[PDB]
Amino acid sequence: AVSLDRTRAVFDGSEKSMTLDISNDNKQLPYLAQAWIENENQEKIITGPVIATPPVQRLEPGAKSMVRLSTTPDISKLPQDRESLFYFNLREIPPRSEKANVLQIALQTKIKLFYRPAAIKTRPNEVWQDQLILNKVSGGYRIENPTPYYVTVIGLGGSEKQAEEGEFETVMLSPRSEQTVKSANYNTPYLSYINDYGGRPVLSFICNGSRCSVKK
Amino acid sequence: AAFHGEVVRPACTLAMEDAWQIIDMGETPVRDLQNGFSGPERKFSLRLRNCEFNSQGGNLFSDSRIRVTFDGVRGETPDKFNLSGQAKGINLQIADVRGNIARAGKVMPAIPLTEEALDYTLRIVRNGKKLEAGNYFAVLGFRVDYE
Ligand SMILES: O=C(O)[C@H](Cc1ccccc1)n1c(SO)c(C2CC2)c(Cc2cccc3ccccc23)cc1=O
Ligand SMILES: [Co+2]
């Protein structure tokens, strides 16, 4: 019943808070919306350095509301030259029916929450994902992410269509890291990633021997 | 419009046929259970709306852009969920459209779909304890993790 207005959140570290809109899309019955944050290991945090308020709220049928994300003074202990990962969680509590022999389903939405320090603040539509490097290795590619940001890779194929629709196990690269993925060899690799807005652009790569970088 | 403010993919809202998001499981299936079978199957459909779930070549679930998990208290075995209420001797089992059985807290495998809908099938099973009919039930979490 209860829904969230985005599939990832970016927290701009130049500010102290932001809000996410939520909705009870069920027009018949009230639902409760519980909110909380988890760290990079999906372990629940409560006192900081990011908090979600209110932790619980009743949404009347069809009601629209918000959840606010705020930082605490301990946010300054996070690195200021790369993103830190959190997860934002929105779990509903459906109205209890006292109906005999029923299974009731309660949706939980869990999205990535990227804390993005002021020193790496981005402009609308800025692309850093074109800095990815692909290295051919046995059975696949070692992908390098030299950037300060998390990068979520959702496709890799020999054409734009294969990047968009081919079978590929999503992988997310931490800032300044590398990860090997299983893959066939592609003469001109195309790679798809998910951007801040939930869109899925495709990048075209050219290879020199085993190393591949985005077509200039 | 060439010029406009930021527009983002919303998270999916879950919709069921029943306003309470409940599936009626039926009377405790004692006679089936004693014969050594599971009780009758009950289908339920979770429609995932507002998130442009389908794309030209696939959809968020099949392509692993979302990952889904059934959350609950595990029953007698990994393949089973515990039930609350007065009944005894029973657990719940959930399966996807290819017969993959959900395990509490374990992500469901990504498969191609057969509808904006995810379709599951539940059934009541034995849990090893003495069967005692009565009412039962459970609240299960359906957790959608966004890539
Ligand atoms: O006991 C219950 O079944 C209900 C659940 C419920 C409530 C509204 C719509 C659908 C389901 N419940 C619930 S759900 O167990 C709670 C929240 C879990 C704590 C509260 C307390 C509560 C409700 C709404 C807003 C609140 C704000 C601050 C503190 C408590 C709040 C009162 C409460 O009655
Ligand atoms: Co536009």
Side-chain angles (χ1 to χ4, degrees), chain A residues 1-15 17-26 28-95 97-181 183-215, chain B residues 1-16 18-26 28-30 32-42 44-55 57-73 75-85 87 89-114 116-128 131-136 138-147:
Chain A
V2 177
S3 60
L4 185 65
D5 61 356
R6 61 197 79 191
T7 67
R8 61 254 298 108
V10 183
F11 193 106
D12 175 6
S14 75
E15 335 267 41
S17 67
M18 59 177 300
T19 57
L20 312 185
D21 290 344
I22 63 174
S23 177
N24 181 8
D25 297 323
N26 184 304
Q28 301 180 50
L29 282 166
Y31 275 67
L32 188 105
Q34 292 185 104
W36 72 94
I37 303 178
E38 290 165 355
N39 69 12
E40 67 185 336
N41 296 324
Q42 300 173 46
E43 307 168 330
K44 293 167 172 169
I45 60 176
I46 187 23
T47 58
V50 186
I51 63 176
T53 55
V56 187
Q57 61 180 297
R58 180 185 177 86
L59 298 171
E60 293 300 317
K64 302 191 181 306
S65 192
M66 293 183 130
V67 174
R68 182 173 293 278
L69 303 182
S70 311
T71 53
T72 71
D74 293 308
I75 198 78
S76 74
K77 274 54 180 99
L78 295 182
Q80 299 294 125
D81 66 354
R82 56 164 278 170
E83 287 190 322
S84 301
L85 177 73
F86 295 88
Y87 290 85
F88 173 78
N89 291 271
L90 186 69
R91 182 170 70 194
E92 73 188 357
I93 304 192
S97 85
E98 287 175 289
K99 205 176 158 209
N101 311 317
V102 299
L103 171 78
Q104 186 162 52
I105 300 291
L107 171 74
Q108 177 186 339
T109 296
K110 178 192 310 224
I111 60 158
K112 301 167 179 168
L113 173 50
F114 300 115
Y115 171 80
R116 185 170 297 169
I120 64 169
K121 178 167 191 169
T122 53
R123 290 158 163 81
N125 298 314
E126 187 168 338
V127 175
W128 49 94
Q129 296 89 347
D130 61 351
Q131 286 171 233
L132 281 186
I133 307 292
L134 316 173
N135 299 101
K136 228 293 157 187
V137 297
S138 301
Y141 287 96
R142 179 182 67 253
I143 304 169
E144 310 166 16
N145 171 24
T147 80
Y149 313 92
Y150 289 79
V151 176
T152 297
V153 180
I154 55 159
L156 178 69
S159 72
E160 175 177 22
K161 187 167 195 267
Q162 284 171 228
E164 285 179 331
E165 302 171 19
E167 193 181 323
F168 185 84
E169 185 66 52
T170 300
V171 63
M172 184 174 59
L173 280 88
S174 303
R176 292 185 299 268
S177 74
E178 54 186 49
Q179 216 166 327
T180 300
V181 297
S183 193
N185 188 252
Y186 297 113
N187 185 222
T188 55
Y190 294 78
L191 184 146
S192 191
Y193 65 91
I194 303 167
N195 62 27
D196 286 359
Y197 315 106
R200 299 174 280 201
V202 178
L203 296 162
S204 170
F205 282 75
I206 290 303
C207 305
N208 193 334
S210 294
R211 197 173 178 280
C212 313
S213 59
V214 170
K215 204 177 166 177
Chain B
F3 308 111
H4 66 73
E6 180 172 302
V7 177
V8 314
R9 181 185 308 265
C12 306
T13 188
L14 192 145
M16 294 172 66
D18 183 277
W20 278 267
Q21 292 183 5
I22 266 155
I23 301 100
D24 187 0
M25 289 309 289
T28 297
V30 184
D32 285 346
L33 262 7
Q34 291 174 336
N35 286 335
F37 307 117
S38 69
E41 294 184 1
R42 310 298 178 197
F44 63 105
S45 183
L46 306 183
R47 198 177 180 93
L48 290 178
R49 299 179 186 177
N50 199 225
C51 56
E52 301 208 351
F53 177 85
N54 294 273
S55 56
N59 63 261
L60 297 179
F61 170 80
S62 301
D63 294 350
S64 296
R65 290 132 159 68
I66 59 181
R67 298 198 196 269
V68 309
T69 301
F70 283 93
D71 286 316
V73 179
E76 189 200 3
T77 64
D79 276 356
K80 289 178 193 183
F81 286 81
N82 201 21
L83 288 165
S84 316
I90 58 169
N91 278 352
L92 200 229
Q93 200 162 65
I94 302 157
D96 74 7
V97 304
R98 297 188 63 94
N100 302 307
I101 312 303
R103 284 136 101 103
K106 259 53 174 190
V107 66
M108 300 290 78
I111 56 166
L113 295 192
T114 50
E116 216 98 331
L118 295 184
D119 299 303
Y120 299 99
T121 299
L122 58 208
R123 71 193 180 162
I124 301 298
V125 290
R126 278 194 177 278
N127 77 345
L131 201 47
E132 305 172 320
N135 285 345
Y136 60 94
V139 180
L140 291 189
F142 185 69
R143 193 212 319 159
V144 181
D145 297 341
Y146 291 76
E147 289 296 350

